[PDB]
Design a protein around this nucleic acid. Structure first.
Lengths: 113, 100, 80, 96, 293
RNA sequence: AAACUCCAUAUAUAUAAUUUUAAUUAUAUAUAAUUUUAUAUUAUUUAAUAUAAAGAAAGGAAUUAAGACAAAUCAUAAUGAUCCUUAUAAUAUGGGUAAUAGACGUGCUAUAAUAAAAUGAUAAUAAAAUUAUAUAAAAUAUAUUUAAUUAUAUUUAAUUAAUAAUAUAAAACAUUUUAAUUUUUAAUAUAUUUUUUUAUUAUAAAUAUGAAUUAUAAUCUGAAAUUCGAUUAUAUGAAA
RNA sequence: GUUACAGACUUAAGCAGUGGAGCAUGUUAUUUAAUUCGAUAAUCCACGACUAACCUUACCAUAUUUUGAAUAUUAUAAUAAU
């Protein structure tokens, strides 16, 4: 059926296979984050019995990779680059310079000070 | 609050109450709409007032008021408590009013 | 998950059925405290390309499946 | 600190009583690190995969009279046509 | 003694996307939509009239103007008698798909992207040479073959032959003199009262001041370079510059006004852009810079 | 090129009800210097060297031209040409990028007295910066007996920022130590050095430097530190 | 291996260092299933990388996908509906 296990809309603007993978994880984890938090609280509350806790720790290990944010890497929304990615503009060491110098980024120019 | 109750409130308020300013300040950031947060603070203050104005369980007068938080806060504060010495203040040295 | 609490690592495993015949269960996961509960069987461990067959020992306890399954091969020499 | 610890804990409990405060005298992991996790979650969804754009083309169900031209698409089509012409196009996909 | 708000440009204008959001992370999202929006708007500059012609409506980069109250995304548009009057044509219809078309129009759907009041405001121009970016665009789209090989002598000449070599020194001197005269007149009127606004500066009104004070207006010197695979016989590069006029404002040289830098890297008067287009020979980038006093 | 420009500096105006308090500030603006004036030697109509005298007067940054090196990038992106479409395209799990004879470059920490370590609560003294993809203060428990420090754990005060937090800046300064160093002590007496003096007996090249390193236990983060992270305690203490 | 000027950390001073030790690195050589790829005089070498456990990731092993990330065409049937 859909390439990704669960059908997902496509990220507006620049689209990349690595971006699609990251975007897929973002969409899935966003919804699963609540469950991720629920079950982890379960496993970590000593105030409980070991078994209920274990059952949970285990399910987590079983939860699919997309159910994680550690797996989501900051990637330039415009150039699909995951290296030197400033998060203030969600860009990169180049698209920034480019956008900032060109003036695409308002109030962002050169540190002449 | 009256003496006993006044002290108990401060003991109950703890860090929220700043003894240096003698002001009890608290904030609410737990509900979607701020209106719910405003009601939360109203209830919290009413609760504190009720407990403080009733030392049946404990007066808390024996408890020394905690000011450690304000002590650390005062360390952060940077003010000048030193002023030009009054004996050094010499009006005769200062020139008198000069008419035009 | 290395701590007195949160001990230790539960990696879902066919140990149950394995505990019957003992079939070396291809536990490709290779990432779990050797379970101190069943502690005893035989399985192969994916060393990147091949799963090395090993069983359970009186040393293999906290030791994680991977610690027994070497990946990179040994170094060699210069040019001649 | 010339004050009985019991009274001190009682005060802490009193604060726990007044301001909705978790009282953990035991110090046993209450999972509160997770219980206190009320920070923004769909932050990644706020940006990144925020779904709400008009992928170029889009424009033909609302504005009908206007005969628009997507230039990049047209160029791509022309390139494909050129490839087909000079025998350098692309072998068919096995329909397996 | 002070740069009239009219003269000096606003730092806001320097930024293509004009918006401020205490919710910073949110504002990043805002600008993101702007550029992508710009691309979509751009693609919508194509035209058709039955396998006849495509009147590319030239457009300036979205000068997004976001301000709580509403959104005022704006762009300058350019395109090519007793007929256009009794029947609106494409361009006018484009204005329609923007704001004039009640709800089925753009600005409307646009609101669902910025949760505010979307008002598109294009601005027509009569001189593809007025906007540096637009200048590169037309040169990178319409011309193409006219330069793909060499720069057709007259084409090149026509390019070099636009403004009458506006003498920046003379223009600067006249403008400076006008400013001094206006200041002197106000000074004299003030002194007449120094010894009501009526006399505070009479003779100064919407006439001798609002336009004589405007500075950037005369394309003193313009440089256009065709850089990239623009040689059918030469695979190599073929950067061809067309330097014209001068690139300095003499007003700043000898007047209270001082040169300011857009984004603190390029002088306000200096405006430049390059429209990278792929030639059959290979992709190229036509950099066009205008002094515009 | 210079100049305008930005930071920075002098002054001046406006703003801040001096509780967002730093008014010794923060900015918006204006002026200011690419300093000037005068005499005396020289020179030849007027420049340099000294002297004074007026001012606060002093820097940094950005901007690196044309061209050339067919310099670097086809892995920021994009695109021509050419090559594959059941695989040079997409996904999951594990692995790898951390492998090591030797060699190079760059750092870090080092080899102790014109130098290193405890300690200093009326907290000696800062700027710049962060904090709705959060910082996380006081305390509270443990490591540990007091207490402090240091590191974790419990609960989240306040602050979404001239408000509260990271965060009491540290070096300097003071006192105490400190191997080799027999320059030491510790038992005597000795005495107008007392935290010291002196007479006598004793006190047999890596140290109390160095932390590479090796075990064990413990803690962080996250499903998950095994190849492979971080932290600490108890141990180890090569090389130099 | 040229007459004469001038410029800068160019040299001579001066201070702190590198080469010598251990470690952390980036690299070459080499190994490996793979140790992705790129820079390699000056301008390579804590350089692309502002952080490689997985993800990032590009690479290797093992399984798995084939109109797939679009755009445009050909038809059948469920979903909002003026």
């Amino acid at each position: 059926n859909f390439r990704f296990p669960i059908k997902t809309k496509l990220p507006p603007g620049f689209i990349n296979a690595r971006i699609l993978r990251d975007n897929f994880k973002r969409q899935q984890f966003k919804e699963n984050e609540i469950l991720v938090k629920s079950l982890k609280f379960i496993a970590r509350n000593m105030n409980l019995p070991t078994k209920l806790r274990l059952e949970a720790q285990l399910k987590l290990n079983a939860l699919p990779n997309y159910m994680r944010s550690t797996q989501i890497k900051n990637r330039c929304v415009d150039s699909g680059h995951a290296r030197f990615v400033l998060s203030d503009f969600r860009l990169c060491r180049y698209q920034f310079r480019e956008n900032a110098l060109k003036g695409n980024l308002p109030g962002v120019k050169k540190g002449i000070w | 609050l009256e003496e006993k109750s006044l002290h108990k409130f401060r003991i109950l308020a703890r860090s929220r109450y700043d003894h240096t300013t003698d002001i009890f300040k608290m904030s609410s950031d737990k509900f979607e709409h701020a209106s719910q947060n405003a009601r939360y603070l109203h209830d919290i203050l009413q609760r504190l007032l009720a407990e403080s104005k009733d030392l049946t369980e404990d007066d808390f007068s024996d408890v020394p008021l905690d000011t450690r938080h304000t002590i650390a806060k005062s360390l952060r504060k940077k003010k000048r408590d030193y002023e030009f010495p009054e004996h050094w203040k010499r009006p005769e040295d200062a020139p008198k009013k000069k008419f035009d | 998950s290395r701590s007195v609490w949160k001990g230790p690592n539960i990696v879902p495993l066919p140990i149950r059925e394995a505990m019957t015949k003992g079939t070396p269960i291809r536990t490709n996961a290779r990432a779990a405290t050797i379970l101190p509960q069943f502690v005893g069987l035989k399985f192969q461990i994916h060393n990147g390309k091949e799963y090395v067959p090993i069983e359970i020992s009186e040393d293999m306890v906290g030791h994680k499946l991977g610690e027994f399954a070497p990946t990179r091969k040994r170094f060699s020499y210069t040019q001649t | 600190m010339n004050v009985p610890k019991a009274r001190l804990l009682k005060v802490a409990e009193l604060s726990a009583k007044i301001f909705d405060q978790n009282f953990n005298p035991s110090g046993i992991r209450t999972g509160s690190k997770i219980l206190n996790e009320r920070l923004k979650g769909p932050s990644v969804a706020s940006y990144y995969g925020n779904p709400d754009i008009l992928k170029f083309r889009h424009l033909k169900t609302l504005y009908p009279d206007i005969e628009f031209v997507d230039l990049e698409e047209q160029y791509r089509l022309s390139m494909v046509e050129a490839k087909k012409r000079r025998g350098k196009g692309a072998p068919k996909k096995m329909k397996k | 003694n002070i740069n009239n708000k009219l003269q000096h440009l606003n730092n806001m204008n320097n930024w293509n996307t004009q918006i401020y959001n205490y919710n910073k992370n949110m504002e990043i999202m805002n600008t993101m939509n702007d550029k992508l929006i710009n691309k979509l708007l751009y693609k919508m500059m194509t035209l058709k009239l039955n396998n006849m012609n495509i009147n590319k409506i030239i457009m300036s980069k979205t000068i997004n103007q976001h301000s709580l109250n509403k959104l005022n995304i704006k762009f300058y548009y350019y395109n090519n008698n007793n007929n256009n009057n009794y029947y609106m044509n494409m361009m006018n219809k484009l204005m329609n798909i923007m704001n004039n078309n009640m709800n089925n129009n753009l600005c409307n759907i646009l609101s669902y992207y910025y949760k505010k009041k979307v008002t598109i405001e294009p601005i027509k121009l009569s001189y593809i040479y007025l906007n540096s970016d637009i200048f590169s665009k037309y040169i990178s789209l319409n011309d193409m073959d006219k330069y793909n090989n060499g720069i057709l002598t007259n084409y090149q000449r026509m390019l070099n032959n636009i403004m009458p070599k506006l003498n920046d020194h003379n223009i600067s001197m006249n403008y400076i003199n006008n400013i001094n005269n206006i200041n002197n007149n106000k000074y004299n009127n003030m002194i007449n009262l120094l010894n009501n606004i009526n006399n505070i500066y009479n003779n100064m009104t919407i006439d001798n001041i609002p336009m004589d004070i405007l500075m950037y207006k005369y394309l003193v010197g313009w440089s256009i370079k065709f850089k990239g695979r623009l040689s059918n016989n030469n695979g190599r590069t073929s950067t061809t510059n067309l330097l014209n006029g001068t690139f300095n404002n003499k007003k700043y040289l000898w007047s209270n006004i001082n040169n300011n830098y857009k984004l603190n890297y390029i002088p306000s008067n200096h405006n430049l852009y390059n429209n990278s287009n792929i030639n059959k020979n290979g992709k190229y980038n036509i950099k066009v810079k205008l002094n515009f006093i």
